[PDB]
């Protein structure tokens, strides 16, 4: 019963946080490296 009580509460609490969070530049492009950026050649 104790394992069930903690796990069910964890599922409800984490889902509430999950739903709450989503409800709430050139420098940026230069700092990161996940997105590749290019230009036209001979332009």
């Amino acid at each position: 019963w104790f394992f069930t009580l903690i796990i069910i509460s964890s599922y409800t609490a984490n889902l509430a946080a999950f739903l709450t969070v989503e409800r709430m530049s050139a420098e940026d492009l230069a700092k990161q490296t996940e997105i590749a950026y290019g230009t036209l050649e001979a332009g």
């Binding site: 019963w1 104790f2 069930t4 009580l5």
Partner: protein, 36 residues
């Protein structure tokens, strides 16, 4: 049927919202169950 071992079992079961195989029948027992 509310012996000392059964009373501890009912109090534990009530606290975890799992119910129990017995329930109080007297007024004194139901007052304790209500506040618990």
């Amino acid at each position: 049927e509310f012996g000392i071992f059964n009373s501890l079992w009912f109090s534990l079961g009530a606290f975890m919202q799992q119910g129990c195989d017995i329930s109080p029948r007297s007024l004194s027992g139901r007052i304790v169950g209500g506040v618990w």
